[PDB]
């Protein structure tokens, strides 16, 4: 995993053939937003301190790849 | 530039030229 | 603050091996641990590595000499006589 | 311990400017010799 | 104060079983095995370690890019540069003395 410094290169990363999926994680305590995209080799992560650009990016990115919201207390397939 | 990598590089070019020969 | 009367460096042997043998070993040991001036660079840093090898710590040159001294009187007299003989004979 | 404390005092004085290098070198060799027992005895020697 | 154990079949401390103690996010103290430490290459003539070149095991040098393994000048590797300056000076002056030595002979010894 490797940081992406700015906003600009995230959309080219997300518009690739091997972008399997993506997810959104929110940290209320630290007021932080994490954007993750999964390629074959790496897991790109983008960190945002503000909240306004998050929705605009969410709708700007292509609709083809799926996006999840990482529910709390992630559990295995077998019942808790 | 060791011989194993040079050997692969020239064989790769050899096939690129055979493909060009069959393309023409 | 001399710590010794006459025994000197060979005091590490305690009271063993006899006075004469300690004197003979001390006389030859004293000249082996000292430092000698280099003949090439001139600095005073040349020390013994092997049984017949001496090397300078500054110019890193290494020279083959005697067992416990850089040069021997026999070898010095032979080099001098050979130089004299050659120069008189051929010049 | 004593050697570092004495040397640290000497370097502090040299850097500040209370003493010069000619006195510094002599005091360094007197500190190397068993001359000064402690910090107060040394500072008294500089004052005198 | 928990004690640790090896994780491989070799039970002896034989300069190839290199270990470190780590604490895991599971709150346990285990052992992690490490390889040996690389050595920096030395100079061909004087014998000192070259600056600007990393120290790795001999196999890892095949995965590193070329500019990271050399320095952009003549005798980039294996020579420090002081030896290169000595080589340049020695070569020029020696050839100059060879020219003057060879030129002297035809006039001073073949004038007859």
């Amino acid at each position: 995993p490797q940081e992406v410094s700015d906003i600009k290169k995230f959309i080219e990363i997300c518009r690739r053939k091997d972008a399997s999926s993506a997810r959104i994680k929110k940290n209320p305590k630290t007021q932080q937003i994490k954007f993750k995209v999964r390629c074959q080799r790496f897991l790109y992560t983008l960190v945002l301190k503000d909240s306004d650009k998050a929705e605009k990016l969410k709708q700007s990115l292509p609709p083809n790849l799926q996006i999840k919201d990482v529910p709390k207390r992630n559990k295995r397939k077998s019942s808790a | 530039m060791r011989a194993k990598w040079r050997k692969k590089r020239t064989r790769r070019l050899k096939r690129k030229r055979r493909k060009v020969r069959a393309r023409s | 603050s001399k710590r010794t009367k006459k025994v000197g460096i060979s005091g590490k042997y305690g009271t063993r091996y006899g006075a004469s043998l300690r004197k003979l070993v001390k006389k030859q040991e004293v000249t082996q641990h000292a430092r000698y001036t280099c003949t090439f660079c001139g600095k005073n840093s040349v020390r013994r590595t092997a049984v017949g090898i001496w090397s300078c710590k500054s110019c890193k040159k290494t020279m083959a000499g005697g067992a416990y001294t850089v040069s021997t009187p026999a070898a010095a007299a032979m080099r001098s006589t050979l130089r004299r003989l050659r120069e008189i004979t051929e010049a | 311990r004593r050697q570092r404390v004495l040397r640290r005092l000497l370097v502090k004085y040299r850097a500040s400017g209370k003493i010069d290098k000619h006195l510094y070198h002599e005091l360094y060799h007197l500190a190397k010799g068993n001359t000064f027992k402690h910090k107060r005895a040394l500072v008294e020697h500089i004052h005198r | 104060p928990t004690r640790v154990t090896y994780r491989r079949r070799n039970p002896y401390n034989t300069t190839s079983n290199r270990t470190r103690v780590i604490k895991t996010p599971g709150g346990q103290l285990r052992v992690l095995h490490i390889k040996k430490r690389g050595t920096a290459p030395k100079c061909g003539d004087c014998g000192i370690k070259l600056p600007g070149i990393p120290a790795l095991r001999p196999r890892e040098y095949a995965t590193i890019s070329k500019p990271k393994k050399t320095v952009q000048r003549a005798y980039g590797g294996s020579r420090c540069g002081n030896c290169v300056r000595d080589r340049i000076i020695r070569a020029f002056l020696i050839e100059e003395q060879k020219i003057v030595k060879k030129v002297l002979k035809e006039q001073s010894q073949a004038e007859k």
Partner: protein
């Protein structure tokens, strides 16, 4: 009885020589046209010490007269040699310490070392720390040279033999006593096992000719004949005389 101790050393099972730490033997270059008619030069790279021997060795690098390559050899270093020296080999080489030139081209009174008994055997005579041989006279017709060996003997050698100027380094190594059991034990250990020494009088009759008895004594003359059966030569062998050397030695 059984086989005595000095007969077992010939089987070469335990009494061999330790040779793991020795890199190469010390020899001259092969005799060639360049060294027979002119001279060649080489650089002295290193002065090294090899185990089991005095007389530190020297590493020399020469060129190749026939091919684009270099050949490494190993000589014995004379006292005064230093790293970076140019050394010369051939018929017309200069007469300085360390040079190698045929034994004919030398005026009387010079000392050499590592002299070949015959031209091309790469050194046979005088190659130990602090020893040398001296030339006595030449015979220009029917070429031959008289030499004097370290032991005092006199010899006649062919005039085409080679020798390298100077005196073997190492000086007076054997002057200070070993003074300690360890230092001697190491010295013999690094070469061949012989450090335990067993007196024949303390032996048993089955083991040694000196045998046992109610007192420690030999029982017979200790001088053994020149022609004796194997297993009997244990003692003073072919002694010409016996006792303390008072006068001068007639043999020369």
């Amino acid at each position: 009885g059984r086989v005595i101790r000095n007969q077992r050393k010939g089987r070469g099972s335990v009494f061999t020589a330790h040779t793991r730490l020795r890199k190469a033997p010390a020899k001259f270059r092969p005799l060639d046209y360049a060294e027979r008619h002119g001279y060649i030069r080489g650089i002295v790279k290193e002065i090294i010490h090899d185990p089991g021997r005095g007389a530190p060795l020297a590493r020399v690098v020469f060129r190749s007269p026939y091919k684009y390559k270099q050949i490494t050899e190993t000589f014995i270093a004379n006292e005064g040699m230093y790293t970076g020296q140019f050394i010369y080999a051939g018929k017309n080489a200069a007469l300085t310490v360390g040079n190698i030139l045929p034994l004919s081209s030398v005026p009387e009174g010079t000392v050499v070392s590592n002299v070949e008994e015959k031209p091309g055997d790469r050194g046979a005579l005088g190659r130990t720390s602090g020893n040398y041989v001296t030339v006595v006279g030449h015979n220009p017709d029917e070429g031959k040279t008289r030499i004097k060996l370290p032991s005092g003997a006199k010899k006649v050698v062919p005039s085409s033999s080679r020798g390298m100027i100077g005196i073997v380094a190492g000086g007076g190594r054997t002057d200070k006593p070993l003074l300690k059991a360890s230092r001697a034990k190491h010295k013999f250990a690094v070469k061949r096992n012989r450090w335990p020494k067993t007196r024949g009088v303390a032996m048993n009759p089955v083991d040694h000719p000196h045998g046992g008895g109610n007192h420690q004594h030999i029982g017979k003359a200790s001088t053994i004949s020149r022609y004796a059966a194997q297993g009997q030569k244990a003692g003073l062998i072919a002694a010409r005389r016996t006792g303390l050397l008072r006068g001068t030695q007639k043999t020369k």
